[PDB]
Structure 1
């Protein structure tokens, strides 16, 4: 029954996260971060919204989505770089 719709209220909060992930993947052996991984943030935000049965994608849903995707990317890097990327993405 539930099909949440999107609004462009938080375009920057997703675009800057995508840019940050791409920048951090430029020179390290890591996930093949591409547009397909950008779509994962949107789809998992939709899934979070669909738990509340809300008809719209809110800022909180996008916050949790960004948290999950960024944590998944970070927790897979090597030890020496992990403790640096812990602080590089302290915003999220």
Structure 2
């Protein structure tokens, strides 16, 4: 029954966060974040909206999707890179 959609207001913030994550990834010499991750973030936000039968995605859905994907991306890295990432990414992995 449920087929959610995005809201066009906060997507500017998502683009800024995507660019920031890419800049930080390059700055520490990590393998870069990609468009596949951004697509996955939007898809997971849709799934979170579907879970409560909401036809709208919301800011908290995007926040939770961002946390899931960012944490998953962090877990793949080497230990020194992992520490730099979590120190910088604190405003996404824990805060928003």
Moved >6 Å (runs of 4+): none
Aligned length in residues: 92
Which runs of 5 or more residues in structure 2 are unaligned? none
Deviation at 1:6, TM superposition (A): 1.1
Q: How large is the RMSD of aligned CA atoms in angstroms?
A: 1.9
Q: Is the 8 A contact 1:14 1:66 kept in 2?
A: no
Q: Scaled by the length of structure 2, what TM-score is found?
A: 0.82
Q: Is the 8 A contact 2:30 2:81 kept in 1?
A: no
SS in 2 for 1:89: helix
Deviation at 1:26, TM superposition (A): 2.8
In 2: Cα distance, 1:20 partner to 1:77 partner: 18
Q: Is the 8 A contact 1:41 1:62 kept in 2?
A: yes
Deviation at 1:62, TM superposition (A): 0.6
Q: Scaled by the length of structure 1, what TM-score is found?
A: 0.85
Deviation at 1:16, TM superposition (A): 2.2
Deviation at 1:32, TM superposition (A): 5.8
In 1: Cα distance, 2:77 partner to 2:90 partner: 16
